[PDB]
Amino acid sequence: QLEKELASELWRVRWEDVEPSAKTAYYKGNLVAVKRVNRKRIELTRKVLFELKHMRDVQNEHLTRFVGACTDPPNICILTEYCPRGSLQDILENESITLDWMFRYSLTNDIVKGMLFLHNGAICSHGNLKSSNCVVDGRFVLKITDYGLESFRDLDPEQGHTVYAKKLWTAPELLRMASPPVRGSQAGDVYSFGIILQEIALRSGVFHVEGLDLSPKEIIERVTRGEQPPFRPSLALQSHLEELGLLMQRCWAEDPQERPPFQQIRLTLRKFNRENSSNILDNLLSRMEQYANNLEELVEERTQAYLEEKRKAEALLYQILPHSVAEQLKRGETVQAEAFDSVTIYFSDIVGFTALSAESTPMQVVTLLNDLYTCFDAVIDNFDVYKVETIGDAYMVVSGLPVRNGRLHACEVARMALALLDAVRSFRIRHRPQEQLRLRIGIHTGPVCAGVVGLKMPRYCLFGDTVNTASRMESNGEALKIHLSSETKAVLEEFGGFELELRGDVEMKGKGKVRTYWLLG
Amino acid sequence: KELASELWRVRWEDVEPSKTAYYKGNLVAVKRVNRKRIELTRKVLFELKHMRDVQNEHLTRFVGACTDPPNICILTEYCPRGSLQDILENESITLDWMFRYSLTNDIVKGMLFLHNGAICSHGNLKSSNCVVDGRFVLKITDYGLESFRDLDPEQGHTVYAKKLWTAPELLRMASPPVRGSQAGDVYSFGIILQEIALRSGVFHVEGLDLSPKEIIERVTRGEQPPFRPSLALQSHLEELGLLMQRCWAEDPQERPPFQQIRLTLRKFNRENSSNILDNLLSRMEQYANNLEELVEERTQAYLEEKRKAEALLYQILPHSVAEQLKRGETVQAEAFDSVTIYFSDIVGFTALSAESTPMQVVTLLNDLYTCFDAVIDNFDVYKVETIGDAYMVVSGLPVRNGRLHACEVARMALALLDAVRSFRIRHRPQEQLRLRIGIHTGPVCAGVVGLKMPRYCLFGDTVNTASRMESNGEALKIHLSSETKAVLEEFGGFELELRGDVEMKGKGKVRTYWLLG
Numbered sequence A: 001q002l003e004k005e006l007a008s009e010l011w012r013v014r015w016e017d018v019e020p021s022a023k024t025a026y027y028k029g030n031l032v033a034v035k036r037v038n039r040k041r042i043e044l045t046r047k048v049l050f051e052l053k054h055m056r057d058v059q060n061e062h063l064t065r066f067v068g069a070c071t072d073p074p075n076i077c078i079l080t081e082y083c084p085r086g087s088l089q090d091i092l093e094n095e096s097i098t099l100d101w102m103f104r105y106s107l108t109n110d111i112v113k114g115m116l117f118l119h120n121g122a123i124c125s126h127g128n129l130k131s132s133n134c135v136v137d138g139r140f141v142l143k144i145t146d147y148g149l150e151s152f153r154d155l156d157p158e159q160g161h162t163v164y165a166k167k168l169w170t171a172p173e174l175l176r177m178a179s180p181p182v183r184g185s186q187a188g189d190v191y192s193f194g195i196i197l198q199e200i201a202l203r204s205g206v207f208h209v210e211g212l213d214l215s216p217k218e219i220i221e222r223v224t225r226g227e228q229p230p231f232r233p234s235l236a237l238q239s240h241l242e243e244l245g246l247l248m249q250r251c252w253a254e255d256p257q258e259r260p261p262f263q264q265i266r267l268t269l270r271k272f273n274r275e276n277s278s279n280i281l282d283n284l285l286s287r288m289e290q291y292a293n294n295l296e297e298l299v300e301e302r303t304q305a306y307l308e309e310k311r312k313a314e315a316l317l318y319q320i321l322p323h324s325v326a327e328q329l330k331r332g333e334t335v336q337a338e339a340f341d342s343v344t345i346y347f348s349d350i351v352g353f354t355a356l357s358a359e360s361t362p363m364q365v366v367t368l369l370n371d372l373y374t375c376f377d378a379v380i381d382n383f384d385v386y387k388v389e390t391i392g393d394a395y396m397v398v399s400g401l402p403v404r405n406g407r408l409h410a411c412e413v414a415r416m417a418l419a420l421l422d423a424v425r426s427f428r429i430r431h432r433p434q435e436q437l438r439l440r441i442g443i444h445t446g447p448v449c450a451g452v453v454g455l456k457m458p459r460y461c462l463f464g465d466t467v468n469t470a471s472r473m474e475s476n477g478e479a480l481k482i483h484l485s486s487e488t489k490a491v492l493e494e495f496g497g498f499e500l501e502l503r504g505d506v507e508m509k510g511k512g513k514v515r516t517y518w519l520l521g
Numbered sequence B: 001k002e003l004a005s006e007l008w009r010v011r012w013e014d015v016e017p018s019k020t021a022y023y024k025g026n027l028v029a030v031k032r033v034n035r036k037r038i039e040l041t042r043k044v045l046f047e048l049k050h051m052r053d054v055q056n057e058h059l060t061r062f063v064g065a066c067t068d069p070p071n072i073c074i075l076t077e078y079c080p081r082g083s084l085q086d087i088l089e090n091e092s093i094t095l096d097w098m099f100r101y102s103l104t105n106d107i108v109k110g111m112l113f114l115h116n117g118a119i120c121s122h123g124n125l126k127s128s129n130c131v132v133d134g135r136f137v138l139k140i141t142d143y144g145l146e147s148f149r150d151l152d153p154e155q156g157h158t159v160y161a162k163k164l165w166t167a168p169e170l171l172r173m174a175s176p177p178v179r180g181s182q183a184g185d186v187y188s189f190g191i192i193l194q195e196i197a198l199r200s201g202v203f204h205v206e207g208l209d210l211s212p213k214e215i216i217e218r219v220t221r222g223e224q225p226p227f228r229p230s231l232a233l234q235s236h237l238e239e240l241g242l243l244m245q246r247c248w249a250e251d252p253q254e255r256p257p258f259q260q261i262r263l264t265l266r267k268f269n270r271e272n273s274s275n276i277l278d279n280l281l282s283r284m285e286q287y288a289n290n291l292e293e294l295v296e297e298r299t300q301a302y303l304e305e306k307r308k309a310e311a312l313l314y315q316i317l318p319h320s321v322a323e324q325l326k327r328g329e330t331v332q333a334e335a336f337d338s339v340t341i342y343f344s345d346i347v348g349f350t351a352l353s354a355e356s357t358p359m360q361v362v363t364l365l366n367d368l369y370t371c372f373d374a375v376i377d378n379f380d381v382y383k384v385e386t387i388g389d390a391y392m393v394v395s396g397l398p399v400r401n402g403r404l405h406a407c408e409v410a411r412m413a414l415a416l417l418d419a420v421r422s423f424r425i426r427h428r429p430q431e432q433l434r435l436r437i438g439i440h441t442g443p444v445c446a447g448v449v450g451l452k453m454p455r456y457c458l459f460g461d462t463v464n465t466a467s468r469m470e471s472n473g474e475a476l477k478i479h480l481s482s483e484t485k486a487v488l489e490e491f492g493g494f495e496l497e498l499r500g501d502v503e504m505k506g507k508g509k510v511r512t513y514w515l516l517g
Ligand SMILES: Nc1ncnc2c1ncn2[C@@H]1O[C@H](COP(=O)(O)OP(=O)(O)OP(=O)(O)O)[C@@H](O)[C@H]1O
Pocket: A022, A023, A033, A034, A035, A080, A081, A082, A083, A085, A086, A087, A128, A130, A132, A133, A135, A145, A146
C-alpha cells in the first residue's frame, strides 16, 4: 500500500488545462494560487518525493491545503487554495479594518495552534514564518501557507546584496554569516512567532520603533552585532497587557534554550484568554459579526464623504451663473435666452475705493474687502438679485431672471437703492476706527440681453447698449448719493410709491444733457 | 406564585431615553401604546403569562411593558440593522437566490413554531415588522399583544395606508380581531413571499398598478380574476410561484396547511447543507463580500468626483491658484514689485453689438470667446475676467518672472494682429471690427477675495488709471504708457513708435508710444 501510494503521483497538476486568467489562477474548478521559483534541475528526489506526498496527506483546521505541483519545463510552482483576504500584515496595517484586541488574541491563539500541529508531526517547523505569509480564509480561519516542500523553493545566495531586502524575521542565530539549512530551527519558530506577535501588537509594519527608524540594512546589521543589550523592537510602555510582552520577551533573548516550547506558550495564552476565552464554535460567528459591523460603518462614513464632494462640485460650476441657472442645470432646459427690456441694474463703486485703500498699508485692507464682500452678499440675499459682476472698479447686479416678471425687477432695484444708501452707513472699517468710505451707485433702465457663454466654466453675460451707456454716463458718480436715468425714472413711476427728486439736466459724455433724479426713499 | 408579581414592570426609571432605548443589556426597542387607562384582568394576567411563555430561537423576546398612567410601551430587544423588506429594498445589498431562499425557509420554521403551541395568532405579519438579528437570525414581531395594538377605530388614513398586509379574508370584515385568522397567517406569508420573490416594494405586479386606495377596494372587491400579484415569469423559480399561486387561496381551506407548506419548501430546498451553523456562516460571508464590493465602488466614485472638482477649480483661477491648492491653505495678497496690465476692447463694440440680433448675439459672443482663446496662449498671462466687450488680463506670475511682464505687451502685440486678421462675426459676415490694446507697466496688490467662490483681484492706481485712459485710444494701434515704454526700452528686440504727450484724464499730458512689432 505504501509503495503503491508513493508511486501514485497524486501531486502532479501538469499545467496543461489550467488557465492563468499575487497571480491567482483557476484550476480544478476552483480558485487557485500558484507561486514559482526559477530552477531547471528538478528530479525524482526520493526524500523530497516523500515530503511532497506527506504534505499532500497533511490536513488540519488551521493549516492550508495543497493541490498540485508544476513539473513542466516552462516553470515549477505550488498550487495553493487561494483565500479572499490579503496577507495578515496588510490586514492589520491598512488601518481600515478597525480591529479589536479580543479579535487579535484569538488570531494569535489560532496561529499558535496551527503552528503547534505543524510541529507535532513528520513535517517540522518551516524555516520562515514571516508575518506576511499568514493568509485569512473565506470563513476567516487563519492558515499558514507556503511551508514545507524543502527542495521546492528558490534556495539561493544568488541575489547577494538584494537578499538583505527580506530576511528581517530570520532567526538571529540562523541570520549569521553562514550557509543556512532549508528546514530551519525550532528556536527559529519561537523567534518568528515573537516577531509576528510584536507586529500584531504594535500595528506598524516590521520593527516599528518610534525613536529611530532604519532601513532593512540597519536593522539587519544591528541584529547581527549581538551587542550586550537584547536588541529587538520595543514594547509599548503600558501595564494593560504585560503578559504578552513578557511572553514575547521569553522568545527574544539570544539564549537558544530560553525561547520556550509551545506547551507553556499555549498555557500562558489560555491563562490570558480566560478573560473571554469561552468556546470553540461560536468564535467564528462573533468575530465575523464584529468585522462586518466595522466594515459597514467604514463604508457608511465613506458614503457620507462622497456626498460632501458632490455639494462642493455643484457649488463651483452651477453657482457661477444666475440662480435661474440653478434651475437651468437642475432640469431647467427651459432656462434660456431672454428678451425682457424691463431690467433694473445697480452698478456702484467705493468713493476712493482703490487709491486710499491700497496706499494706506499693504495687506491691511484685503481682509476688510472680504468682510465687505461677505456682508454685502448676505444683504444680497435680502432681495431677488442675480449679481452679475464684482469688477475691481465696481460690482454690478441685475435682477429679473428668477421670475419672468416685468414688475419684480424694478421694485427690487428701487429697494436696493435704499439698501445701498443704508450700506453707506454699514460695514465700517473695523481696523481703522477713524476711517470712513462711502459708496456711489446709479440705476439705468432700458433694453438688455442676457445669455450664457463659456465652455469650461460658463458664466452669464448681460450686454446692452443701455448697459454701456449707463457705465459711460455713471463714470462721473458722486459720493454718498445715487443717480437715476430717464428709463429707470419711468420704471419708478409705475414701480410703486417712492420719494424721487429732480436733480436737473446733466451733460453726459455720449449722452448729452440727460435729466437726472435723486432717490431719497 | 405566578400571580404574585408580574415581572413586566418596565418603568423608564430603570431605562434611559438616552426610537430604541437602553436597559442594562443591549439596546431594548420600545413601542408606545395609546391606552391611557387600564383595568387589568385575569385576561391580562394570562396575556403576560403567554408573553413570557415562549423563548423560541426565532421569536424575539420582550421583558416587560410599561403600564404607567400617562404612558405604556413594550420593551423588546433592539435587533439592529433594519428590516428584511428594507434589507432587500435598498439596492446596495445584493442578496443571491440562495440567500433569499434560505431566508424564506427560516421564516417557514419560525412561523411553524409561531402558533403551533400556546400562542394562537398574531395577525400582523408585515414584512417590515420582521427584522434581521445581529447575526442573521430572523424573527417575527409583536406576537401575543393580547390588547397591545391601535385598536381605536379610525376607518380613515389608517385604513388607507396601514392595513394592506391583511388578506381579503381579513379584509372582508368590519370587526378586526386582536389575533388574525390561521388562514390569515397563511395569507400574510403569501404576500410576504410576494414581496421577497421580487425586489418590488409591496403588492405590485408590473403593468397597471393602481394607487393604495384602489389597492384597498381591489382587495375587498375581488372578482373571478383572482387578483393576487403574479410572480416573475422567470422559470427558474416557477415552482415558488406554484406555492404563491396557492397560498392566496380563494377558498379559505385551500390555503394549505402551514406544516405542509414547510415540508413542500423542504423538498423545494436547495441542497446546500444540513448544518445549523454552516448556513449562518455562509450567509455572513456573502453579506461581507457584498459590503466590500460597496466599499470599493464608493471609493472609486469619490476619487473620480474629487479629481474632476480639482480640475475645475484649477481651471478657474491662475496657476498660482493651482500651487495654492496644492498645499498652502492660508493665502494673503501679494504686493508685487512691478507688473504689466493690458486692457483690450474694440471701438464701438457696445454700439455694434447692440445693433445685432440678441439671439445671433449669443453666437457672436461664442465667436468672441473662441477668438479670444487663440490670444489666450501667448505667454504667462492670467485672464482676470470677461465682462462685456473688454477682454483684459495680467502677466503677473506667482514668482519673479525676470521682468516678464514686459513680455506681456509683446504677447498682446503679437496676438492682436493674428486675432483680428482671420476672426469674423458668424452672424455678421458683412460687418468687420478693429481691435485697440492699452498697455501699462506698474505695481499692484493682488489676492484671493472670498472663500466660497474665491477669485483673484488685483488693485493698483496704475491699473485703474490705465484702464480708464485706454478706454479712449488711438485707432487700430496698440498704445503703451510711457511708464511701460521705458520698461520696453529695457527689453530689446522690438520697435516702438512715440505717439507723444496725449491728454490723459487725471494725468495731464502723458507720453504714449505706438507698438511697432
Ligand atoms: N494564501 C495565499 N497564497 C499565496 N499568495 C498569497 C496568499 N494570500 C496572499 N497572497 C499574496 O501572494 C504573495 C505571496 O507571498 P510572498 O510574496 O511573501 O511569497 P515570497 O515572498 O515568494 O516568499 P515568502 O512567502 O517567504 O515571502 C503575498 O505577498 C500576498 O500578497
